[PDB]
Design an enzyme around this catalytic site. Structure first.
Site, short mmCIF file in Angstrom:
data_model
loop_
_atom_site.label_atom_id
_atom_site.label_comp_id
_atom_site.label_asym_id
_atom_site.label_seq_id
_atom_site.Cartn_x
_atom_site.Cartn_y
_atom_site.Cartn_z
N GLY A 47 71.87 46.66 80.69
CA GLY A 47 73.15 47.25 80.99
C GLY A 47 73.57 48.37 80.06
CB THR A 48 72.00 49.95 77.11
OG1 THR A 48 71.85 48.66 76.49
CG2 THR A 48 72.42 50.95 76.05
CE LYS A 50 67.61 49.11 79.62
NZ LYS A 50 68.13 48.22 78.55
CG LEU A 52 73.65 57.77 83.67
CD1 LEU A 52 73.67 58.34 85.08
CD2 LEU A 52 75.04 57.34 83.24
CG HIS A 172 83.31 55.28 83.69
ND1 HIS A 172 82.67 54.19 83.14
CD2 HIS A 172 82.38 55.95 84.40
CE1 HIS A 172 81.40 54.20 83.51
NE2 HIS A 172 81.19 55.26 84.27
CD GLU A 253 98.33 30.52 66.61
OE1 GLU A 253 98.14 31.68 66.21
OE2 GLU A 253 97.42 29.68 66.74
CG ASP A 329 91.59 28.07 62.61
OD1 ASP A 329 90.74 28.44 63.45
OD2 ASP A 329 92.80 28.34 62.69
N1 LIG Z 1 76.28 56.26 78.02
C1 LIG Z 1 76.95 56.03 79.17
N2 LIG Z 1 77.91 56.89 79.58
C2 LIG Z 1 78.57 56.66 80.72
N3 LIG Z 1 78.30 55.60 81.48
C3 LIG Z 1 77.34 54.72 81.10
C4 LIG Z 1 76.65 54.93 79.93
N4 LIG Z 1 75.77 53.93 79.79
C5 LIG Z 1 75.91 53.11 80.85
N5 LIG Z 1 76.87 53.60 81.65
C6 LIG Z 1 77.33 53.00 82.92
O1 LIG Z 1 76.83 51.67 83.03
C7 LIG Z 1 76.47 51.40 84.39
C8 LIG Z 1 75.25 50.50 84.46
O2 LIG Z 1 74.06 51.27 84.29
P1 LIG Z 1 72.64 50.59 84.59
O3 LIG Z 1 71.76 51.62 85.25
O4 LIG Z 1 72.88 49.27 85.27
O5 LIG Z 1 72.05 50.28 83.12
P2 LIG Z 1 70.58 49.64 82.95
O6 LIG Z 1 69.72 50.37 83.95
O7 LIG Z 1 70.22 49.93 81.51
O8 LIG Z 1 70.79 48.18 83.25
C9 LIG Z 1 76.23 52.74 85.06
O9 LIG Z 1 76.94 52.80 86.30
C10 LIG Z 1 76.78 53.78 84.10
O10 LIG Z 1 77.84 54.51 84.73
#
Ligand SMILES: Nc1ncnc2c1ncn2[C@@H]1O[C@H](COP(=O)(O)OP(=O)(O)O)[C@@H](O)[C@H]1O
Ligand SMILES: Nc1ncnc2c1ncn2[C@@H]1O[C@H](COP(=O)(O)OP(=O)(O)O)[C@@H](O)[C@H]1O
EC number: 3.4.24.-
Lengths: 420, 420
Positions: A47-48, A50, A52, A172, A253, A329
């Protein structure tokens, strides 16, 4: 989809710009002997973002893009994957220098595997064929692919830091109609550890909550409340708390926040609430960091330990009968004190050594001196949190009676009340 | 591809020269009774260069060479491997004394296996048939192949020593246009543990970095910076460090280098830098060895232990508040002192014995005397690093203020500053 549409990773862009240049003037890399690799391996947490990056580089210079997922090769009929691969390279070789992406290669790396290695070695790197692979695991990969001529150049992607999340949010939110009081820096500092994929989901959830009532703008209250429902859960107003039992939570708290403000080293509070949320939770306090740090001193660890023992020191002074609320805690305040002694070597009696890593190799005479130090660090701090409370007691009740009707108090009001 | 094109292994060449001679005058080996083996087994770490030797010996005397990989036999259809083997020997027997290479035999050693053993026993060694096998593992091999008449002669290849890497670099850089200030001896001593395959990749990466800016020569700065990106990683200029937090790192690294120079036994420093690199790293110091050693004394182990405790002794004297940075230099400085006592027997109280190797068989009275010695060796050295710093304090600030702007200092300037 140029590089202006991707933010939060400045080391996978600057390092991955000559590939665009190599597809423009390949003459510069042959006068010396450069052998620009045929395959590029993108590695990082899932989810980083890659996938894109490959689309961005493909769109940077107008070039066909062919995306193929390795998950599709899973459970396919025998020979279908090999035929698909052969047709893919047959299409690719017919066109200009193209871009081919293969996703999820960890699962694949049997029949299609061997066919891929041979066919990859067939064509030449000067034709203009580029292969990009994206795996979520660098260890389960086939070792044969690491040999030279195969995938040999790897790019590591990392989760964004504080400034990266601001850029992702800026990217976004361009289309959506934000209100006038929404500050993106505050929302950037309250979301640590979020990968770039989750922030778009956060924006969508905020849009949903704004749309439920019906209004053409998204105010700040929707953003702040939408973050909570992701971390802990939705509010539970059906739960009933006895009137004599919610007075204890108001004191447990309001004491953890007075102590956490008086001590020098710490991070400021944001709000205090006693509305139940999630499962097995009855009240929480939120902090917002001022910046990002990487080194922690010793005096900054003796003041994070006094704050944790602030709630238990407020029931004892007021009621005199300790309850069972402060059971988490106490667990987290006793492993902080077992690192200052064993690993980090911040004890003046045992010296600069690392007792420990199975996980125990030392005598019994030594093991009876670590406890006499742990029991002395923790007790010494617990005698000081009680001392802090006794000074600010007339100003501790005011924080409670306000908190028993509105059910929420802000940080600015707290810091105004404490400093009379 | 004669032996002049292979460097770094003088024991797999001198030992493997009569095979060339045996293919010239086989009459010398029959007057006595020599029975030159039919199969030769090359064993060593992967990437050492096993495959290149077979090609070299094949090209030494003009002879056909037939290469077959055992990985190709994997997942082949039933009977295809046997047919390929039969056709291979059918082709081989038709020609003059030939050379046949089989690669990756560990995986194979079922149907093709038994066919190989029988067919190998068929032909005679006097025809001129030589079989060379190259495995990456000597234990998982089929025990039946170790019987006489089968593969019985083995040659072990080893990673190069200091002088071998110089020869490999000399071999791989003949074509490329190096600059005039590039010294290959310096780059030879900063790359320990590299197998012969990685140095060509290093040269290619240096070529890429030279080509990115665009220039017809490769200077020294490209070589030195290309080595770092392989060990640690690319530089990270996006990371932000607070101004009051990068002053601590400047003192933690300028103290580890002053102590490591004053003590007699040690290796000289090369450069000091505080640019972040990789994940979880904030500064490093590099050394270059003067030669290669195999025996370590005791006084050379009490001075490698004082250097490690130099960083922690610089924060305490200057600031007085110990941080959490030196948590890996304490772990590695306490297992050096647990070998001088347990295994190597360099303790004057416990005598020349080997307490230890499960992994613990001794009483509790003994186990309480090893700790009283470990805690005495380490503490005694830590009291001396602090003493060294107090003398060179006026000359320790100068090293810092220079290091806070240029972000890098060289070894020669350091050793000039220390010796006023
Ligand atoms: N550096 C970034 N800038 C803008 N959007 C990002 C960025 N990195 C990830 N995203 C968003 O995260 C979403 C998930 O991307 P994804 O292709 O599923 O990642 P991966 O292929 O690494 O799992 C995408 O729709 C993208 O818009
Ligand atoms: N002794 C050596 N001298 C020069 N080059 C070597 C030497 N050993 C290995 N190499 C280089 O390492 C590279 C990898 O060789 P390779 O055949 O993959 O080794 P192996 O078959 O043992 O895995 C070759 O291209 C070769 O040029």
């Amino acid at each position: 989809v140029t590089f202006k549409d991707v933010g939060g990773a400045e080391e996978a862009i600057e390092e991955l710009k000559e590939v665009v240049e190599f597809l423009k003037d390949p003459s510069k890399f042959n006068r010396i002997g450069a052998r620009m690799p045929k395959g590029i391996l993108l590695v990082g947490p899932p989810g980083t973002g890659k996938t894109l990056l490959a689309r961005a580089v493909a769109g940077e210079a107008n070039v066909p893009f062919f995306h193929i997922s390795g998950s599709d090769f899973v459970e396919l009929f025998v020979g279908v994957g090999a035929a698909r691969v052969r047709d893919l390279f047959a299409q690719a070789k017919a066109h200009a220098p193209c871009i081919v992406f293969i996703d999820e290669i960890d699962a694949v790396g049997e029949q299609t595997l061997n066919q891929l290695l041979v066919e990859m070695d067939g064509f030449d790197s000067k034709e203009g064929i580029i292969v990009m692979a994206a795996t979520n695991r660098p260890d389960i990969l086939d070792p044969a692919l690491l040999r030279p001529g195969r995938f040999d150049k790897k790019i590591v992607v990392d989760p964004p830091d504080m400034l990266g999340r601001k850029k992702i949010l800026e990217i976004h939110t361009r289309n959506k109609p934000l209100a006038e009081d929404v500050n993106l820096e505050i929302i950037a500092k309250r979301t640590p550890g979020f990968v770039g994929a989750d922030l778009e989901n956060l924006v969508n959830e905020a849009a949903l909550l704004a749309a439920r009532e019906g209004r053409d703008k998204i105010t700040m209250k929707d953003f702040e409340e939408a973050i909570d429902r992701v971390i802990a859960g939705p509010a539970r107003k059906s739960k009933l708390i006895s009137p004599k039992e919610k007075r204890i939570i108001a004191y447990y708290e309001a004491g953890h926040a007075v102590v956490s403000t008086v001590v020098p080293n710490g991070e400021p509070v944001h709000r205090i609430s006693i509305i139940p949320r999630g499962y097995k939770a009855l009240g929480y306090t939120l902090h917002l960091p001022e910046e990002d740090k990487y080194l922690v001193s010793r005096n900054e660890l003796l003041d994070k330990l006094t704050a944790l023992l602030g709630g238990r020191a407020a029931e004892e002074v007021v009621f005199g009968d300790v309850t069972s609320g402060a059971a988490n805690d106490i667990e987290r305040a006793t492993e902080i004190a077992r690192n200052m002694v064993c690993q980090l070597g911040m004890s003046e009696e045992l010296g600069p050594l690392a007792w420990g890593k199975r996980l125990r190799n030392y005598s019994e005479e030594v093991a009876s001196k670590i406890d006499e130090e742990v029991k002395k660090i923790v007790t010494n701090c617990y005698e000081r949190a009680k001392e802090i409370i006794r000074k600010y007691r007339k100003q501790l009740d005011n924080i409670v009676e306000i908190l028993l009707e509105k059910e929420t108090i802000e940080g600015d009001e707290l810091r105004r009340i404490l400093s009379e």
